[PDB]
């Protein structure tokens, strides 16, 4: 067994379905334009900045020093059965250290949220333009009266697809960093290589993951709207969606290593997660809590300068992005750590790819 081995396109039917669906959205935006919606809508028918920059500088510093903050920070919360879970908190801290190291080796990774937000904003602008166009297409008769149903479904699916593409890109970058034996022969552009691998292969996997996510998101939105348009709310399925979203992220990483279809990768990810259920709880409850304290650190320091309320808002928005990638890198680092443990041992010919810090933990 070797990682990053003979990649091939995965989930061809789902990629074809996603392309057909995107062509359908283009057909929506083309029918609206052809009928005249575009012409008859555009034409109609009868000190402060300096602190904001300090948010980026301090947040980027946090991507490289949060590993050390958490090591001594957890202690004061530990001041006063906890002994059983201590080893898992130590594993979380080690994974945070490795995340800091990969950020050191891949400085450009912090800007992935900015590129993803640019793509999402472009798509959202296009979707709002098409929604306004549909608001005047035509009254519109026939079965095409549900073109806006199609459009909303497409908004949800495509937004989830772009977010999952971000997740897959980050997972690929972290996987390339982790499974490379020595770091001095790293690819010249690890992130660009990950993007190329995502585009050429595994696009169907991301499409299927986003489809699965939206299939549950749409019921949640409908339930929320119906409840607002009124007793007891069963919208707690958002927990299922949140849990499903986490499973999808672990499914992309398993797809990035073994180049497996979405079903097999998701099954493997679920098996690994349940096999390490306690470790997953500690990393997602203690690790996440320390990330939240990191966000509070950024906003507090930026607002410590003082009118400037907008500065505090911007620092929070950027902090949620840099920290979000830190949670993505920690989660991907964990699954890569579990795949190595299952498929490899200390014997010769199957040597571990993990770092020294994580070596002692198994």
Exposure of 140 in the CB half-sphere (CA atoms within 13 A): 18
First-to-last alpha carbon distance for the chain, in angstroms, is 20
Half-sphere exposure of 139 (CA within 13 A, CB side): 3
Q: Distance (Å, rounded) from C-alpha 234 to C-alpha 217?
A: 14
Six token digits for residue 306: 């003082």
- Resolution given for this structure, in angstroms: 3.2
Method used experimentally: cryo-EM
- Element at 351 (helix H, strand E): none
Could you count the other beta carbons within 10 Å of the beta carbon of residue 346? Answer: 9
Cα distances from 52 to residues 48, 60, 99, 313, 319, in angstroms, run 7, 13, 25, 9, 11
Q: How many CA atoms lie within 13 A of 171 on its CB side?
A: 30
Angle, CA 119 vertex, CA 18 and CA 113 arms, to 5°: 115
Q: Residues near 322 by Cβ (< 8 Å), separated by ≥ 6?
A: 59, 60, 62, 63, 110, 113
Whole-number CA gyration radius for the chain: 23
Tokens 């982790």 label which residue? 178
Tokens of 165: 């593409």
Exposure string for 22-55, b = 16+ CB within 10 A, e = fewer: eeebeebbebbeebebbeebeeeeeeeeebbebb
Taking the mean position of all CA atoms in its chain, how far away is CA 263? 19
The DSSP secondary-structure symbol of 236 reads T
The domain segmentation of the chain, as residue ranges, is 12-46+52-359
| Residue found under tokens 């398993």 | 254
Confirm if 352 and 271 have CB atoms less than 8 A apart: no
Query: Chain centroid to CA 250: how far?
Result: 10
Question: Within 10 A of 110 (CB to CB), how many other CB atoms are there?
Answer: 20
Considering Cα of 104, then 107, then 111, then 112, what sign does the dihedral take? negative
The Cα 152–Cα 154 span in angstroms is 5
d(CA 151, CA 172): 31
> Are the C-beta atoms of 3 and 179 separated by less than 8 Å?
yes
Region for 347 from its dihedrals, namely left if φ exceeds 0, alpha if ψ lies in -120 to 50, beta otherwise: beta
DSSP class of residue 190 equals H
Q: Using CA atoms, how far apart are residues 158 and 152, in angstroms rounded to an integer? A: 10
Tokens of 73: 């920070």
**Shortest CA distance to 140 belongs to which of 43, 44, 28, 218?**
28
Angle between helix 262-275 and helix 309-343 axes, rounded to 10 deg = 90
Distance (Å, whole) CA 23 – CA 31 = 12
**Token duo for residue 133:** 């166009």
Torsion, Cα of 69, 279, 161, 120 (10° steps): -10
Residue pair 243/55 in contact (Cβ under 8 Å)? The answer is no
Distance of CA 73 to the CA centre of its chain: 26
- DSSP for 129-157 reads HHHHHHTT-----SGGGGHHHHHHHHHHH
The neighbour count for residue 258, using CB atoms within 10 Å, is: 19
Which of 25, 100, 18, 28 has its CA nearest to residue 67?
A: 100
Kindly report each contact of residues 51-55 with a partner whose C-beta sits within 8 Å and lies 24 or more positions away, as own/partner. Answer: 51/302, 51/305, 51/308, 51/311, 51/315, 52/302, 52/311, 52/314, 52/315, 54/301, 54/302, 54/305, 55/298, 55/302, 55/311, 55/314, 55/315, 55/318, 55/319
Closest of 344, 315, 294, 325 to residue 52, by C-alpha = 315
């Amino acid at each position: 067994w070797k990682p990053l081995e003979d990649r091939s396109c995965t989930d061809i039917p789902w990629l074809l379905l996603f392309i057909l669906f995107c062509i359908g959205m283009g057909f929506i935006c083309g029918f609206s334009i052809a009928t005249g919606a575009a012409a008859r809508l555009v034409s109609g028918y009868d000190i402060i900045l300096g602190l904001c920059l300090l948010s980026l500088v301090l947040s980027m510093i946090l991507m490289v020093i949060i590993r050390y903050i958490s090591r001594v920070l957890v202690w004061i919360l530990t001041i006063l059965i906890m002994l059983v879970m201590r080893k898992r908190v130590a594993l979380t801290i080690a994974l945070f250290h490795v995340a800091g190291k990969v950020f050191i080796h891949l400085p450009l990774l912090v800007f992935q949220p900015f590129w993803t937000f640019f793509a999402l904003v472009l798509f959202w602008v296009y979707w709002i333009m098409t929604l306004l166009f549909l608001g005047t297409t035509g009254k519109i008769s026939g079965p095409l009266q549900y073109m806006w149903w199609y459009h909303v479904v497409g908004l949800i699916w495509i937004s989830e697809f772009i977010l999952a593409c971000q997740q897959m890109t980050v997972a690929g970058a972290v996987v390339t960093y982790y499974f490379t034996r020595d770091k001095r022969n790293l690819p010249f552009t690890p992130i660009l290589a990950s993007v190329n691998r995502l585009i050429r292969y595994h696009l169907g996997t991301v499409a299927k993951g986003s489809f699965i996510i939206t299939l549950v998101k749409i019921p949640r939105m409908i339930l929320m709207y119906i409840h607002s348009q009124l007793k007891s709310c069963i919208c707690c399925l958002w927990c299922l969606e949140k849990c499903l979203n986490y499973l999808n992220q672990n499914a992309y990483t398993a797809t990035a290593i073994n180049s497996t279809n979405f079903c097999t990768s998701a099954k493997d990810a679920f098996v690994i997660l349940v096999e390490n259920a306690l470790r997953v709880a500690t990393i997602n409850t203690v690790g996440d809590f320390m990330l939240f304290l990191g966000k509070v650190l950024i906003v507090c320091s930026t607002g410590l300068a003082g009118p400037l309320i907008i500065v505090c808002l911007f620092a929070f928005l950027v902090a949620h992005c840099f920290l979000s990638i830190y949670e993505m890198v920690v989660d991907v680092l964990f699954l890569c750590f579990a795949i190595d443990t299952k498929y490899n041992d200390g014997s010769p010919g199957r040597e571990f790819y993990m770092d020294k810090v994580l070596m002692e933990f198994v």
